[PDB]
């Protein structure tokens, strides 16, 4: 009938009320001051507030406030001021606590959705989620948490229904408690599954284009690949893409091969062309394959691993693209130590610098011819420096994904500490709604009910341990 009455649940030795009270005061004030510190840091910094991906932290901090103040005020409303609690204020406090927990769960939900978008769909993260979509989503999350918190005040209490009534908390019924615990539990299960799937899929997909998956040296790999195609050892060139006119300049490559066919150095060259598309270009490539004995054309669909090996074996990769927005082929080539010879247009203009690879103008077979000749000239010397520089640059463009994975790991840590802190309490609520309700379980509930405040204590501690940008903003504040 009274909120936060320790003597109701367990008999406490009268020698340590002062110690319990002062510990509760220190913990509550520490939580409140550190949460306001987190809000001040996250709001006074332009860099963090302009990033939607960190928004959840603020939301969590707000939730960390909502469960904290309602704690300490309820200590003031009972101990130092001996006023009793009516039905309305008790339901208000219970709604505040439940709103804090539901807001934490929903913030983790929006954070998981954002993590999936940012990690596994990187080409859409910039343009799907922005300021208005994220702020609207967080607003609806907070409002739905608020309304499920407020539902018992509208007439879903134990008094009005006159039904079977809960024992662990008065003035509420079993049906509302079951509904709230069910939606929270199914949400948390979905979060666990989603974060496990995100961390599993991104583990193999991100670290896939590394040279650690290839066995043997580059020279013997190239020799084995060329012997598989029935060709002699030489400087190898690779093209992989789409057989069409306008998107990828494969016709430019074929014209360049025809131009080099008139020279004496063509017999040293080896050419591999992989693609599928217009039958005219396919027939043209087949005619060049039948004419010269150092040109191989592959049309059937290739697996990912096979193409990984091909990048690992060839010496140069030709990308004569007319319009290449993202330059993914260059990134995959340089991740596996292949020098790219690409047209200076689109992303290929700024992925490849003048030192890493060779850049030509778009649509000129002559410039491509001179570039291939210069590549063969450079192949006389050692190309290990080019390989290492291309690998370094390609790994440099992948730095965003690793930070996204680190943020996902921080979110997983937040979720698991939430689960650890709210496990026994949720299980005790399950035991209350389903089955009997004895005094020992009441004492266990009273003991583990401090884990919510401990959870609110430890949530902003790990932000400093994980978020470097939050530390930078805090240092800039001082």
């Amino acid at each position: 009938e009274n909120f936060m009455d320790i003597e109701c649940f367990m008999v406490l030795n009268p020698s340590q009320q002062l110690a319990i009270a002062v510990l509760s005061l220190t913990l509550g004030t520490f939580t409140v001051l550190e949460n306001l510190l987190v809000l001040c840091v996250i709001l006074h910094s332009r860099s963090l507030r302009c990033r939607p991906s960190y928004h959840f932290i603020g939301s969590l901090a707000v939730a960390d406030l909502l469960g904290s103040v309602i704690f300490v005020y309820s200590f003031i409303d009972f101990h130092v001021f001996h006023r009793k609690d009516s039905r309305n204020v008790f339901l208000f406090k219970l709604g505040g606590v439940t709103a804090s927990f539901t807001a934490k769960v929903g913030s983790l939900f929006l954070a998981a959705i954002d993590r999936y978008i940012s990690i596994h769909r990187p080409l859409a993260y910039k343009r799907i989620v922005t300021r208005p979509k994220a702020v609207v989503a967080f607003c609806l999350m907070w409002t739905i948490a608020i309304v499920i918190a407020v539902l018992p005040l509208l007439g879903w209490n134990c008094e009005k229904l006159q039904s079977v009534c809960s024992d662990i908390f008065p003035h509420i019924d079993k049906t509302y408690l079951m509904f709230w615990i069910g939606v929270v539990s199914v949400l948390l299960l979905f979060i666990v599954y989603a974060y496990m799937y995100i961390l599993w899929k991104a583990g193999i997909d991100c670290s896939f284009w590394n040279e650690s998956y290839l066995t043997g040296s580059r020279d013997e790999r190239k020799k084995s690949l060329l012997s598989k195609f029935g060709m002699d050892e030489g400087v190898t060139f690779m093209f992989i893409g789409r057989f069409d006119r306008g998107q990828k300049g494969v016709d430019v490559l074929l014209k360049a091969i025809e131009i080099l066919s008139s020279k004496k150095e063509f017999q040293e060259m080896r050419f591999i062309i992989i693609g599928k598309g217009d039958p005219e270009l396919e027939g043209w490539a087949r005619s060049l394959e039948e004419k010269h004995g150092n040109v191989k054309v592959i049309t059937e669909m290739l697996s990912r691993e096979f193409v990984r090996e091909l990048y690992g074996s060839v010496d140069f990769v030709i990308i004569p693209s007319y319009f290449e927005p993202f330059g993914l082929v260059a990134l995959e080539a340089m991740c596996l130590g292949a020098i790219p010879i690409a047209s200076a247009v689109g992303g290929l203009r700024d992925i490849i610098t003048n030192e890493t690879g060779i850049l030509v103008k778009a649509g000129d077979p002559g410039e491509l011819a001179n570039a291939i000749l210069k590549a063969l000239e450079l192949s006389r010397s050692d190309l290990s420096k080019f390989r290492e520089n291309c690998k370094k640059r390609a790994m440099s463009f992948s730095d965003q994904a690793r930070m996204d994975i680190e943020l996902a790991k921080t979110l997983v840590l937040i979720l698991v500490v939430l689960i650890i802190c709210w496990g026994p309490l949720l299980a005790i609520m399950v035991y209350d709604v389903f089955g009997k309700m004895n005094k020992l379980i009441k004492t266990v509930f009273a003991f583990c009910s401090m884990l919510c405040l401990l959870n609110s204590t430890v949530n902003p501690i790990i932000y400093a341990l994980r978020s470097k940008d939050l530390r930078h903003a805090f240092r800039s504040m001082f």
Epitope: L123, I128, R304
Partner: nanobody, 121 residues
Framework: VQLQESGGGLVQAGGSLRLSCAAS????????MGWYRQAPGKERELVAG???????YYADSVKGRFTISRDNAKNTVYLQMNSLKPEDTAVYYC????????????????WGQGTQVTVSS
């Protein structure tokens, strides 16, 4: 995904014209938008292309005359041409490419219905 065109019709030489292509997908819909044109007795060719922002590409015969833009409020692509030439009479299609990040060779191309545009001197 579903692709719809609008804005087709005849126009006099030296005029102006707009086409709008709308896409309906599940996640971000298309990744790369483009316009292709096909003259009678002539294979289809890429008039213009866009991914996002100022990362555009125009065919060498229409540079400085055509322009292309993208809108995220309705996830559409807008093609503007000014000072029409009488060799621009063709059927126009909007092409949507969804390409996978993990392995660049895989891609999905979707073609719309297309509209007939005739330029009269």
């Amino acid at each position: 995904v579903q692709l719809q065109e609008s804005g087709g019709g005849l126009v006099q030489a030296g005029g102006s014209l707009r086409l709008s292509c709308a896409a309906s997908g599940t996640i971000f819909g298309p990744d790369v938008m483009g316009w292709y044109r096909q003259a009678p007795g002539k294979e289809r060719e890429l008039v213009a292309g866009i991914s996002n922002g100022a990362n555009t590409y125009y065919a060498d015969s229409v540079k400085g005359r055509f322009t292309i833009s993208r809108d995220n409020a309705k996830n559409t692509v807008y093609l503007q041409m000014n000072s029409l030439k009488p060799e621009d009479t063709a059927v126009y299609y909007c092409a949507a490419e969804v390409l996978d990040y993990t392995f660049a060779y895989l891609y999905h191309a979707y073609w719309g219905q297309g509209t007939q545009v005739t330029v009269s001197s």
